[PDB]
Amino acid sequence: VLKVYGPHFASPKRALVTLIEKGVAFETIPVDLMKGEHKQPAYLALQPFGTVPAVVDGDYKIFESRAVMRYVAEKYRSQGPDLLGKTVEDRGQVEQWLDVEATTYHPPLLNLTLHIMFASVMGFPSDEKLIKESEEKLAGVLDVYEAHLSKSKYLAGDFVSLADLAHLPFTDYLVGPIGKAYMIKDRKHVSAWWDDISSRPAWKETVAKYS
Amino acid sequence: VLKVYGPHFASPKRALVTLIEKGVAFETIPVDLMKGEHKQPAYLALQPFGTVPAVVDGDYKIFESRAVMRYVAEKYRSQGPDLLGKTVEDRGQVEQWLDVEATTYHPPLLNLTLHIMFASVMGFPSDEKLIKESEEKLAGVLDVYEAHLSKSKYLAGDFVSLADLAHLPFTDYLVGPIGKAYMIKDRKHVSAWWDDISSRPAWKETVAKYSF
Ligand SMILES: N[C@@H](CCC(=O)N[C@@H](CSO)C(=O)NCC(=O)O)C(=O)O
Ligand SMILES: N[C@@H](CCC(=O)N[C@@H](CS)C(=O)NCC(=O)O)C(=O)O
Numbered sequence: 108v109l110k111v112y113g114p115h116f117a118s119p120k121r122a123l124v125t126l127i128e129k130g131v132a133f134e135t136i137p138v139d140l141m142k143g144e145h146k147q148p149a150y151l152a153l154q155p156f157g158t159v160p161a162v163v164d165g166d167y168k169i170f171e172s173r174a175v176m177r178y179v180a181e182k183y184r185s186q187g188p189d190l191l192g193k194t195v196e197d198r199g200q201v202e203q204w205l206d207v208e209a210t211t212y213h214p215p216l217l218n219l220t221l222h223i224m225f226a227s228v229m230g231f232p233s234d235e236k237l238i239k240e241s242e243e244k245l246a247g248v249l250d251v252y253e254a255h256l257s258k259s260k261y262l263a264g265d266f267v268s269l270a271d272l273a274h275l276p277f278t279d280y281l282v283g284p285i286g287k288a289y290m291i292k293d294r295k296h297v298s299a300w301w302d303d304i305s306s307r308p309a310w311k312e313t314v315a316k317y318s
Numbered sequence: 319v320l321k322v323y324g325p326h327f328a329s330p331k332r333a334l335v336t337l338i339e340k341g342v343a344f345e346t347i348p349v350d351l352m353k354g355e356h357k358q359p360a361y362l363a364l365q366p367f368g369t370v371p372a373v374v375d376g377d378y379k380i381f382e383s384r385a386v387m388r389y390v391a392e393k394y395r396s397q398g399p400d401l402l403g404k405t406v407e408d409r410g411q412v413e414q415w416l417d418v419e420a421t422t423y424h425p426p427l428l429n430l431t432l433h434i435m436f437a438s439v440m441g442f443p444s445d446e447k448l449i450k451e452s453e454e455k456l457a458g459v460l461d462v463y464e465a466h467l468s469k470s471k472y473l474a475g476d477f478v479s480l481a482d483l484a485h486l487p488f489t490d491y492l493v494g495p496i497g498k499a500y501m502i503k504d505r506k507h508v509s510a511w512w513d514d515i516s517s518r519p520a521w522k523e524t525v526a527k528y529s530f
């Protein structure tokens with residue numbers, strides 16, 4: 108059976124929600140950051156960068172949360188919703204917004220996450236200028252989304268996909284523990300899109316089980 | 319008919335080398351980054367984040383360099399080398415190392431690119447601490463690569479793929495204009511791997527046509 112490392116962190120939830128959307132069986136295995144488990148040889152043999160998630164599916168090993176998403180959506184393509192779209196062009200749009208999430212959307216949001224949610228618990232001083240910069244930067248990204256989502260129901264078109272799902276875990280933080288829900292709520296089309304994808308049963312189940 | 323925007327810059331070269339590898343016919347359209355062409359209404363209708371590349375293919379538009387790679391490799395899958403691998407498991411490994419390049423390899427290398435090659439665009443005084451941090455970070459990533467590449471000929475297995483090619487444009491800066499070639503040279507397997515992918519005819523052609 109397929110196994111996922113680190114379900115309680117945000118990044119692996121990109122993979123968990125995809126597994127649940129596709130109706131795939133899996134088990135999860137915790138990783139104790141506090142005891143440095145992710146920096147010890149056993150976990151490094153799965154994920155050599157020492158970050159989560161890591162996924163082992165029988166003889167097969169794969170890491171990077173969005174790579175895992177793609178692997179699952181391709182392998183189990185014919186069940187559940189098609190999170191890759193139907194055509195090469197559809198899939199191109201999914202990949203495009205998957206890469207926007209990885210390279211443009213996530214990095215400032217990760218900064219807000221580290222400095223607002225884990226400054227205290229990890230023992231880092233909260234970087235107040237970086238917080239202001241990261242928010243301004245994320246707000247510009249969200250303005251682009253707002254325009255796009257007024258002409259398109261989901262990021263890659265009229266169908267929900269991996270690109271939408273990739274936004275769930277850290278945006279859950281943004282509207283929650285990070286305390287900046289207004290960044291989503293104040294943008295009509297972004298806000299309705301968030302209401303849509305974040306109330307899907309697969310995401311609700313992920314959150315009930317792995318928060 | 320397929321058109322690539324901003325060929326003289328590094329990120330678009332990811333798309334070009336994939337196009338050339340696949341033997342696809344294309345044209346290029348210059349974008350003047352210095353005068354802010356990429357931040358004006360004409361280019362923003364193509365790429366709403368105002369960066370290059372953007373690709374227009376008949377009725378179809380797509381941006382993000384690695385998405386363009388995936389799109390080209392899939393649309394033309396049945397010609398040239400298969401840069402996506404053969405199986406779902408192979409493609410999984412390609413996607414893994416493509417995402418390592420996007421999220422782990424590239425960010426510190428981009429910081430080195432900006433702050434050393436384009437110092438004036440980042441402003442003065444030069445951020446020497448961020449430069450030192452970026453080099454340390456990239457060196458850590460390169461150590462993982464060295465270990466991995468001692469057990470695997472290319473990143474995703476025994477076949478060259480998008481994941482390897484995605485490394486060409488900025489690593490070319492690293493060993494050249496950035497002036498930190500030892501980061502590759504001092505790592506035996508990384509160095510031999512680099513010698514291999516950067517001597518491919520498609521990469522040689524990309525560089526011959528689109529540098530200045
Ligand atoms: N968004 C960031 C980095 C992207 C960038 O500009 N990259 C290079 C092109 S790499 O081949 C660049 O600075 N070009 C500027 C120029 O030549 O005018 C910034 O500019 O502040
Ligand atoms: N994630 C994007 C990044 C593209 C990118 O940053 N391109 C650079 C040139 S290499 C650019 O357009 N810089 C202009 C700017 O950001 O102002 C991709 O890979 O396509």
Ligand SMILES: [Br-]
Nearest residue numbers: 113115137138
């Ligand atoms: Br965990």
Ligand SMILES: [Br-]
Nearest residue numbers: 324326348349
């Ligand atoms: Br150009």
